[PDB]
């Protein structure tokens, strides 16, 4: 599917369908202050093509939304390139949310989770966040129904972490996926076979970098690669783009080339050589 840009959806769900063909959201996704919505508005609303968000996902005051299992069933990675304070996932004052249900979420590459003040929210104690975030120390998961819920799981890969039992499930009908330790963050197939080391979270076939659901490093021409090879540039810290792409952006921020990256603007101490979008340093003061 498409790569869509960061979005900020308020008041109406009309603009939410702009996401219908996205595989990747290159930016953040904020859905907020939806006071007109009811559960019926979300019974037939799904974005099954969405696999990854490069920055953060934020949900605040969205009426009638009871679970995210139908909205984002296949969301596998939130990269956290840019964060909301220090958070890659924010669920705040979500009036009717009964469960997260992000049963395909395998990795949050950078940043923490803040799930606060969700009066109906359950299925939180059942999630092993250590499988998703390296550091759960900065998680702030407080003031939810689950602070007594009666969370009931399908069968799940239950575990004891410290002295705490954690059943590892997202909903009454969805377990949390777990891979052998040898797979690290790469993911595995249903049979436990490791995805390629260039994959992140999941793959359709083992040990094949063209069969990844998402990439650990960079994406190029249906393949996960360690770094962008020439003549390509690193873009948004997840994909390889060509000069012409960076140039088209500039002529539509006015994007520049710097250290094999296509970026919004020249850093301090540099000026942009006009004929080739290239940041050049300033000998003496910058013009």
């Amino acid at each position: 599917g498409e790569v869509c840009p960061g979005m900020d959806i308020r008041n109406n769900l009309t603009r939410l369908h702009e996401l219908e063909n996205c595989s990747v959201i290159e930016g953040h996704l904020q859905i907020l202050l939806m006071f007109k919505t009811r559960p019926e508005d979300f019974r037939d609303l799904s974005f099954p093509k969405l696999i990854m968000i490069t920055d953060y996902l934020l949900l605040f005051r969205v009426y009638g939304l009871e679970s995210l299992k139908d909205l984002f069933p296949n969301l596998t990675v939130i990269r956290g390139s840019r964060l909301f304070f220090n958070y890659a996932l924010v669920i705040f004052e979500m009036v009717h949310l009964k469960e997260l249900g992000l049963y395909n979420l395998m990795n949050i590459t950078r940043g923490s989770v803040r799930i606060e003040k969700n009066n109906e929210l359950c299925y939180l104690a059942t999630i092993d966040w250590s499988r998703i975030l390296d550091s759960v120390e900065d998680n702030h998961i407080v003031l939810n129904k689950d602070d007594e819920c009666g969370d009931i799981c399908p069968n799940c890969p239950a575990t004891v972490i410290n002295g705490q039992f954690v059943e590892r499930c997202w909903t009454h009908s969805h377990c949390q996926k777990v891979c052998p330790t040898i797979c690290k963050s790469h993911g595995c197939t249903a049979e436990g076979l490791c995805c390629h080391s260039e994959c992140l979270g999941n793959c359709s076939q083992p040990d094949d970098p063209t069969k990844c659901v998402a990439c650990r490093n960079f994406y190029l021409d249906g393949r996960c690669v360690e770094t962008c090879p020439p003549p390509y540039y690193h873009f948004q810290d997840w994909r390889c783009v060509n000069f012409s792409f960076c140039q088209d952006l500039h002529h539509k921020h006015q994007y520049v080339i710097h250290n094999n990256k296509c970026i919004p603007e020249c850093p301090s101490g540099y000026t942009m050589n006009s004929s080739n979008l290239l940041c050049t340093p300033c000998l003496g003061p910058c013009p």
Partner: peptide
């Protein structure tokens, strides 16, 4: 923090 809380409070001083 209270800073996160305060960000939201302050946003609700927008027009809809």
């Amino acid at each position: 923090e209270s800073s996160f809380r305060k960000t939201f409070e302050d946003y609700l001083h927008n027009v809809v």
